[PDB]
Design a protein around this ligand. Sequence first.
Ligand SMILES: OCCC(CCO)C(CO)(CO)CO
Ligand SMILES: [Cl-]
Ligand SMILES: [Mg+2]
Ligand SMILES: [Mg+2]
Ligand SMILES: [Mg+2]
Ligand SMILES: [Mg+2]
Lengths: 228, 228
Amino acid sequence: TTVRIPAGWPATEEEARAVQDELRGRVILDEPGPPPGTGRVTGVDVAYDDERDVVVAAAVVLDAATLDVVAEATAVGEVSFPYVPGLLAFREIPTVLAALDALPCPPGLIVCDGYGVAHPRRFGLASHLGVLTGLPTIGVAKNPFTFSYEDPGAPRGSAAPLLAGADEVGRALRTQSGVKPVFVSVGHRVDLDHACAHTLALTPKYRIPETTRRADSLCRRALKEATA
Amino acid sequence: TTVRIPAGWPATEEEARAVQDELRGRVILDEPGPPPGTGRVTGVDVAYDDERDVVVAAAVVLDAATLDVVAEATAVGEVSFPYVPGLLAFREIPTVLAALDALPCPPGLIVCDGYGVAHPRRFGLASHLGVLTGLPTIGVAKNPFTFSYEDPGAPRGSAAPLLAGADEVGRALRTQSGVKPVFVSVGHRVDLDHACAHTLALTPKYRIPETTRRADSLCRRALKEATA
Ligand SMILES: OCCC(CCO)C(CO)(CO)CO
Ligand SMILES: [Cl-]
Ligand SMILES: [Mg+2]
Ligand SMILES: [Mg+2]
Ligand SMILES: [Mg+2]
Ligand SMILES: [Mg+2]
């Protein structure tokens, strides 16, 4: 049941960049998005195997109000693109879509362990996934990549602009008091204020969103099982 | 264990105002809030000791329809900020959050015995807790602070604008006929009409909302036990 490379999927960097520039026009930035603490919120993450050209994706759906897990699914796929910085999403999108499709319920708001508009072409994983699914998505990353930012306030909740050159592409958000911030960016159909609100609601106990913690653990386990 | 002052909690009035000026912009005013009589509603209140620099917070969750108590939690903490009018919330927020975190269920709607937008800087306890938790909140106060208002009608349910200069920051609400009014203000993710509707729902017999009566009694008992 391995997810194969989609028929006609980009095979060159020129084609991939062309897809990004074309699909970016479908991104919605002025829709505030759903509020935190209600409905469903889903984490997505992937694990790449080092021995075979396979990638495993996991989607974990949480009840936003309680943060309890209500559903989960994984998918195994063929890596669909060579390793090229700036086009990394082309390696895993097909498999991520498969994991989401395997869920027994809608994901609600999708939280990716990565970036959305905070990308060289303003079309990272979260934005790419958002436009293809038509669903609200955001990205929360552990490191700032090559972006810059002023240290946000020390208290949890504090934020600061995350910049690509001089342009704001997200926010450094303090999820835990006095602890290193995470980097939040909009993906699709969610604004920055709401992206931050969801990230804080997913981090009452840890620095990393529970959606990422859950999805990370699950795809790693599924990858181990797939290679066994 | 005693809730200590957060790793990066404000230490100066300048830092405190910085937090307020940053989070105030994230307060939500265009949402109606949960329908009264549905789900759960939570009261929060604190008790300060005169001899020891400690504050005790209590969170009591009620069934919105019946007003029956369904959950309770308390927390004892170090006063996290010196006494400075306009920044009083910085002394108790960490402890209040600890109490909320210890609850076995989502709060639903947080009703504070204090103020929300009706604050000398438009960011009182209710609004601050709202932005930090992402939850809907309102403030219900026993006195009008320094705000002006005309006596509301005599019958229960009667209301009148609570003004800060010329701007409405809440409403003087008659919760009981022949009894002085209380002062309701939006905290976060709730509108004034709903804040008042919830306040009337919480006052079928007494002047003070049952959420406050419950939380007040609980933090007071917890404080006595803590300093015993
Ligand atoms: O509902 C699960 C999370 C809650 C903790 C229990 O009320 C929380 C309370 O403010 C949010 O509703 C965050 O600690
Ligand atoms: Cl990329
Ligand atoms: Mg990962
Ligand atoms: Mg991972
Ligand atoms: Mg009180
Ligand atoms: Mg009291």
